């Protein structure tokens, strides 16, 4: 027990550290190297930002939550942290979605779309992602206690209240994960099937890496959210922790499946680390 806590804080802490370091490297490498400053990498920039926010704030506060056994910081910063976390995670997923769309359009109309698409459009789509994430999650999180008339959240624990009622739970969860993953998988299927063998094996390779990443990371919690919404004593806390962390690590593996999956990005990376 004396070495266990430090082991936990070391694993989780170092994980978060690797997250923020990696994404900082992405942003920095995109700003520093003009050659990779394409419109397709602006989405990677926004993604790196969201994953940075997740990497610094969500991971450490949830590490604290889990390592102490309860949430001491208070109801105000509880609602704040949860709002932030959900909004920026949803932002991350919407970013992945918008990347999927962009890649689809770049694939289908290979000569018209890349020229027709401008940076202003990219900024517009990014802003759309963040805004829609905020609207979908933030107002429902903080103002649920004001509407219900009580804060269902226990004094020691810090979860979201509206999951106590399934009607909103499903509606938000599918709009955050299920619908977006359906769209991503189907249009990526369009990409793979219509685009393309070295040229063709690789497409299925990258698409598979990306989709398997997104799924193995985001699916556990989203289905755990659906399980707990039916019965209260049904889900313990250890598996919950596992699910939450599994959701967090996506923001750690994002530079691998989008940035470092390309050849130049890593070569750029090396010089920053190699001074």
């Amino acid at each position: 027990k004396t070495f266990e806590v430090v082991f936990i804080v070391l694993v989780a802490g170092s994980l978060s550290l690797v997250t923020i370091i990696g994404n900082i490297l992405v942003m920095v490498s995109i700003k520093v190297n003009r050659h990779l400053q394409t419109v397709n990498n602006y989405f990677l920039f926004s993604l790196a930002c969201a994953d940075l926010i997740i990497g610094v704030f969500s991971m450490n506060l949830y590490t604290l939550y889990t390592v102490i056994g309860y949430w001491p910081l208070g109801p105000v910063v509880c609602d704040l942290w949860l709002a932030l976390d959900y909004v920026v995670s949803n932002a991350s997923v919407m970013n992945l979605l918008i990347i999927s769309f962009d890649r689809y359009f770049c694939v289908t109309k290979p000569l018209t779309y890349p020229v027709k698409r401008t940076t202003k459009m990219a900024g517009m789509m990014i802003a759309a992602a963040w805004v829609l994430s905020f609207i979908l999650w933030a107002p429902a999180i903080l103002f649920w206690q004001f509407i219900v008339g009580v804060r269902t959240v226990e004094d020691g624990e810090c979860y979201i209240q509206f999951f106590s009622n399934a009607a909103v739970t499903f509606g938000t969860a599918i709009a955050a994960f299920y619908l977006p993953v359906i769209i991503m998988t189907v249009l990526y299927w369009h990409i793979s099937r219509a685009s393309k063998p070295s040229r063709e094996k690789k497409v299925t390779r990258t698409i598979l890496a990306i989709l398997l990443a997104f799924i193995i990371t985001w699916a556990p919690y989203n289905v755990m959210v659906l399980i707990n919404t039916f019965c209260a004593p049904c889900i313990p806390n250890t598996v919950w922790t596992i699910g939450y962390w599994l959701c967090y690590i996506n923001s750690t593996i994002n530079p691998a499946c989008y940035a470092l999956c390309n050849a130049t990005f890593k070569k750029t990376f090396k010089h920053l680390l190699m001074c």
Partner: nanobody, 121 residues
Framework: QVQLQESGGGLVQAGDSLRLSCAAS???????????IGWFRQAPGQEREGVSC????????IYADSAKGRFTISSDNAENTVYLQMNSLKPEDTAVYVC???????????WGQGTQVTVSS
């Protein structure tokens, strides 16, 4: 990184033909195979529209609706150099022709210097 230089730029009367060649320099790690290459013409004050594009690894040709039937594109995989031959040209095809290369999903995208092609009559 890599510079892409073009050739063949010159004068031609209506009905004649030309052969623009785009050569790409030596690249580190990335294989010429891993790059798809397209030709883009830029007319005075006009938007940089795409004429055609070729995937050397697959040999797949994708032409624009404007230059279909006249323009033919290929390459030499061993030489790492692409050739775009245009036939039966019009004075509407007076523009600066540049050579672009995009890695899949539009990372590592490159643009060249460009050569002038002016059609008389």
């Amino acid at each position: 990184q890599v510079q892409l230089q073009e050739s063949g730029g010159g004068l031609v009367q209506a009905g004649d033909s030309l052969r623009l060649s785009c050569a790409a320099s030596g690249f580190d790690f990335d294989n010429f195979d891993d790059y798809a290459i397209g030709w883009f013409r830029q007319a005075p004050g006009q938007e940089r529209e795409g004429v055609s594009c070729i995937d050397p690894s697959d040999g797949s040709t994708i032409y624009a609706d404007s230059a279909k039937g006249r323009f033919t594109i290929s390459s030499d995989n061993a030489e790492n150099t692409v050739y775009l031959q245009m036939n039966s040209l019009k004075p509407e095809d007076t523009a600066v022709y540049v050579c672009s290369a995009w890695t899949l999903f539009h990372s590592d995208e490159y643009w060249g210097q460009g050569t002038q092609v002016t059609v008389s009559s």
